[PDB]
Amino acid sequence: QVYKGGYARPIPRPPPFVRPLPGGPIGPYNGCPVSCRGISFSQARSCCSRLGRCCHVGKGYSG
Numbered sequence: 001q002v003y004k005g006g007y008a009r010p011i012p013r014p015p016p017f018v019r020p021l022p023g024g025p026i027g028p029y030n031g032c033p034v035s036c037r038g039i040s041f042s043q044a045r046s047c048c049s050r051l052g053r054c055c056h057v058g059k060g061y062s063g
Helices: 041-051
Strands: none
Touching: none
8 A cells, every 4th residue: 555654643753762661670689698608709700790799709818
């Protein structure tokens, strides 16, 4: 059929892009205690960049 750029509304100009709203999973603080205890070295490193938690894990000589 022919192209109709005005169904009912004359010159129906569409709106521009709009800022969406991400929800995310519920209960994000369920695997990263502030004490940084009970987690692997790589696990603690991951939470530091994920929520700024456990960023100074490990200090001084060990073993």
